[PDB]
Design a binder for this molecule. Structure first.
Ligand code: CDL
Ligand code: PEE
Lengths: 62, 53
């Protein structure tokens, strides 16, 4: 398993490793925080659907 | 005209009460005492605005 962690490196040279994983071209235009906005924002969207539960008893929905 | 009016008004009051409770038998419009026993909301139409208990 320690040799499996280095599997994608054995097929590459050092120059290819640096260009592949180290020298990623700079691009600061992405909305990186969309991952959190989708996750935490899902609580509000889930509430919009959940506030319509056809459970007749009020205390059941409580 | 006073006597004619109170005759028509008495029929009107019974006919007006008959709209909410129609006449099924000889008893006439709104002549059933069982309608005024304890009633509950139907299962498909509960109290929409407030708590029941
Ligand atoms: C045509 C006739 C019908 C034929 C088809 C019939 C079959 C239909 C099913 C297949 C089609 C489904 C379509 C979507 C495909 C999804 C495929 C999938 O794998 O999903 C698995 C999906 C996700 O699994 P999961 O990984 O465990 O994520 C849920 C975790 O809770 C997550 O928890 P977390 O902490 O890890 O993360 C928090 C999470 C937020 O998660 C929560 O907070 C929810 C927590 C639940 C409440 C807590 C109480 C939990 C109680 C536990 C017991 C629950 C049992 C419920 C069983 C429900 C069975 C489905 O936030 C997020 O991660 C991102 C959320 C934002 C996502 C963006 C929203 C996109 C949704 C799609 C939009 C378009 C659809 C139309 C609009 C919706 C309909 C009006 O499983 C679910 O279904 C979860 C329940 C969601 C409620 C579903 C209600 C919508 C149903 C729509 C039906 C059609 C509309 C009505 C049409 C009527 C006329 C026909
Ligand atoms: C949200 C309001 C919608 C209506 C808007 C009306 C007003 C119109 C005026 C808009 C002016 C536009 C100003 C510029 C806004 C810029 C938008 C922005 O910054 O985010 C874009 C950004 C681009 O992402 P990147 O690729 O990382 O960045 C590349 C940048 N070139 O978009 C995103 O991140 C995605 C999230 C955006 C909102 C997504 C909406 C999701 C709603 C889900 C409902 C759809 C149903 C889904 C069903 C799923 C079925 C499998």
């Amino acid at each position: 398993d320690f040799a499996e962690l280095l599997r994608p490196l054995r097929s590459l040279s050092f120059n290819q490793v640096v260009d592949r994983y180290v020298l990623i071209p700079p691009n600061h235009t992405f909305y990186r925080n969309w991952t959190y906005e989708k996750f935490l924002g899902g609580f509000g969207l889930s509430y919009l659907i959940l506030r319509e539960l056809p459970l007749r008893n009020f205390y059941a929905r409580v | 005209i006073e006597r004619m009016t109170e005759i028509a008004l008495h029929v009107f009051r019974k006919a007006r009460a008959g709209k909410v409770r129609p006449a099924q038998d000889v008893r006439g419009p709104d002549g059933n005492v069982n309608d005024f026993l304890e009633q509950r909301r139907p299962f498909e139409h509960p109290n929409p605005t407030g708590v029941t208990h």
